[PDB]
C-alpha cells in the first residue's frame, strides 16, 4: 500500500539552514509528482512546492523563492526540501503528497500524505 | 493562485444536524477543486475530488456539487466522528487552500 514518511524536521535558530526528507514507497515513485505543503501553528494549509516526475520541472511560492529547493532521487525513491535561511515565519508541519500520474493534470493529485515532520525555527 | 474563500469559518452543530460549508473562487477554475477533513493532530484527508466524486471508503452522507466559482461540501447527518475542521483545494492551477471551516459540539 502507498505510504509516505517525512524526517528532518527540528529545532533550529534563525538563519540556519535545514533539510526535509521524505521516504516513499508502495507504488512507482518514479512516475509521480511530488508536493510539499506546510501549516502554520493555528493557522491552514499553504502549498510550498512542486517537483516533476523526471525531476524537470521545479515551482515554488513567491514566498519561499531563492530560499528553497526542491530535489528527488528517483532510485531511493526520496524527495527532499533544502531551506536556507530560515525566518521566524517558516514554523510549521511539513507534509509531502503525491502529485500526479502520467498523462493528467500537472496540477492533479494531492490523495496521500505523510504524517509530517514539524520545523520550528526558534532560539 | 486564485483567491479561495471559505465560509463560515465555524459553526457549532449537535449529532444529526444537516451542515453546509461552501467555497468560492475568484476565477472559474471549472471542477478541480477537492474536500479535506483533518482532525486535531493528524494529517489532512480527502473526501472529495473533481468536485463531485467520492473518495473510496467514504461514507455516503458526504457530497459535494458546484462548478465554476461556487462550490459546496454537505453532510446530511452529523456523525460523533465528523467533529473536525474542512478545507477546499484548488487544483485548476497553482495549489491554493481555502481559510478552513471547524465544525464544533453544541
Known amino acids: 500500500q502507498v505510504q509516505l514518511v517525512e524526517s528532518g524536521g527540528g529545532l533550529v535558530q534563525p538563519g540556519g539552514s535545514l533539510r526535509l526528507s521524505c521516504a516513499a514507497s508502495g507504488f512507482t515513485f518514479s512516475s509521480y509528482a511530488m508536493h510539499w505543503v506546510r501549516q502554520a501553528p493555528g493557522k491552514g494549509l499553504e502549498w510550498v512546492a512542486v517537483i516533476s516526475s523526471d525531476g524537470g520541472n521545479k515551482y515554488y511560492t513567491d514566498s519561499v523563492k531563492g530560499r528553497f529547493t526542491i530535489s528527488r532521487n528517483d532510485s531511493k525513491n526520496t524527495l527532499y526540501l533544502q531551506m536556507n535561511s530560515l525566518r521566524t515565519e517558516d514554523t510549521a508541519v511539513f507534509y509531502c503528497?503525491?502529485?500526479?500520474?502520467?498523462?493528467?493534470?500537472?496540477w492533479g493529485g494531492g490523495d496521500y500524505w505523510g504524517q509530517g515532520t514539524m520545523v520550528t525555527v526558534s532560539s | 493562485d486564485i483567491q479561495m474563500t471559505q465560509s463560515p469559518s465555524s459553526l457549532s452543530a449537535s449529532v444529526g444536524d444537516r451542515v453546509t460549508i461552501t467555497c468560492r473562487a475568484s476565477?472559474?477554475?471549472?471542477?478541480?477543486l477537492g474536500w479535506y477533513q483533518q482532525k486535531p493532530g493528524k494529517a489532512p484527508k480527502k473526501l472529495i475530488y473533481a468536485a463531485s466524486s467520492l473518495q473510496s471508503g467514504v461514507p455516503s452522507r458526504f457530497s459535494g456539487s458546484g462548478s465554476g466559482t461556487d462550490f459546496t461540501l454537505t453532510i446530511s447527518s452529523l456523525q460523533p466522528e465528523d467533529f473536525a475542521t474542512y478545507y477546499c483545494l484548488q487544483q485548476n492551477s497553482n495549489w491554493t487552500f481555502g481559510q478552513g471551516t471547524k465544525v464544533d459540539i453544541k
Open positions: 503528497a503525491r502529485g500526479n500520474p502520467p498523462y493528467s493534470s500537472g
Open positions: 476565477q472559474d477554475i471549472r471542477n478541480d
